[PDB]
Every structure is written in C-alpha cells, then in structure tokens.
Design a protein around this ligand. Structure first.
Ligand code: HEM
Ligand code: NA
Ligand code: NA
Length: 167
C-alpha cells in the first residue's frame, strides 16, 4: 500500500449547472474555500489517501468546499471534502453534502456517494496514479439537486493525478 504524496483533481460538477447557477433563473453564485476554479472546472489539491498498486484500488482525498446559492437563498448546496475511490476501472465520488429543498429546508446527506465512476483511463504504478472517469449521479445526489436531475444523470467527468510514495 502506497501513500498519496501530492494529488490534484479537476471537476466542473456539471457545465449546465454552472450556467444555470450564474443565469437569470437561479440568479445565483458559488463561493470556494480551499478549492480553485479554472477552465470551467473546480480545482482540488490534496496530500492524503492510499493506493494499492498491485490490486489497482485506492482512495484519493481532498479538502475544501464549494458552496452554491441561488433562488433568493432557497438554493443552498455545499459539497465538501471530495474523495475519489476506485477498484479497478470503477469507483465512487464521495463528498460531504448539505442541500436545501425547494421549500428552503436544509437536508444533511452525510458523507455520501455523489456519483459512480467509470474510468475511461486509469493508470496506477509505483510512483503515480492518474485517470479520467464519467460521473453518474447517485440517488442521494439526485435528491440534493432537488430532483431536477434523475439518478444516473451523467455529470461532468472527473480527472485526477497523484504522485505516490511511502510504502
Ligand atoms: C423556488 C425554488 C426554485 C425554482 C422556482 C426553480 C426553478 C428552476 C427552473 C425553471 C429550472 C429550469 C427548468 C428545468 O431544468 O427543469 C431549474 C433548473 C434547475 N434547478 Fe432550480 N429552482 C428552484 C430551486 C432549486 C433548488 C433548491 C435546487 C437544488 C440544487 C435546484 C436545482 C436545479 C437544477 C439542478 C436545475 C437543472 C439545471 C441544468 O443543468 O440545466 N433548483 N430550476
Ligand atoms: Na500523504
Ligand atoms: Na477506496
């Protein structure tokens, strides 16, 4: 089992969601704490997790939060502490999620699977792990998005790279 030395990830959540949040209906915004933003993707930086290079499994852990607001404060969604977990060419995108419903009532989703990952590329070696995966919204994620997306909705893809060490 190898430790994660430095990891980075890029994920836009969903391009059409970014456009909706900033557009004339939601009339909203996002703020970021420990997360960047560039080329329509949120930017994550972490130094924890572990990878099994022989079995091609692992977890890559990131700190930081994205906070979406809109609809006069009725929309209020936080996604924090994302984790990319993988076992072979499939995995899970896990995060701490809190989101308000269309009545303005906040619901805490715990540390939940936000989406299922299917890797189109995944390389794991002694010194590096990297890959790209489609992200399919989970049932809990659908509820957090106020049912505007069905479970199984394809979100933006997620990519990551990590240097590994410390066996
Ligand atoms: C008074 C409250 C709200 C009203 C009136 C409202 C209205 C709308 C309308 C008219 C649309 C576009 C039509 C559609 O895609 O079905 C939309 C899209 C959407 N709304 Fe809001 N909404 C509200 C609150 C919320 C909340 C609390 C969330 C939770 C995250 C949310 C998430 C979404 C999503 C995910 C979409 C789809 C955006 C896309 O990717 O195209 N909405 N909403
Ligand atoms: Na580490
Ligand atoms: Na894992």
């Amino acid at each position: 089992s190898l430790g994660v030395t430095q990891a980075s990830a890029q994920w836009g959540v969903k391009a059409s969601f970014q456009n909706y949040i900033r557009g004339s209906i939601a009339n909203g915004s996002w703020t970021l704490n420990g997360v960047g933003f560039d080329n329509q993707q949120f930017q994550f930086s972490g130094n924890s997790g572990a990878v099994d290079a022989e079995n091609k499994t692992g977890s890559i852990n990131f700190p930081g939060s994205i906070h979406f607001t809109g609809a006069g404060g009725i929309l209020d969604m936080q996604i924090a502490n994302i984790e990319i977990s993988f076992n072979g060419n499939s995995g899970e995108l896990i995060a701490d999620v809190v989101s308000s419903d269309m009545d303005g009532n906040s619901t805490n989703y715990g540390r939940t699977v936000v989406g299922t990952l299917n890797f189109s590329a995944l390389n794991v070696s002694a010194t590096e792990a990297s890959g790209s995966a489609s992200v399919s919204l989970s049932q809990s994620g659908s509820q957090a998005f106020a049912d505007f997306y069905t479970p199984g909705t394809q979100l933006d893809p997620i990519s990551f790279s990590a240097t590994l060490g410390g066996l």
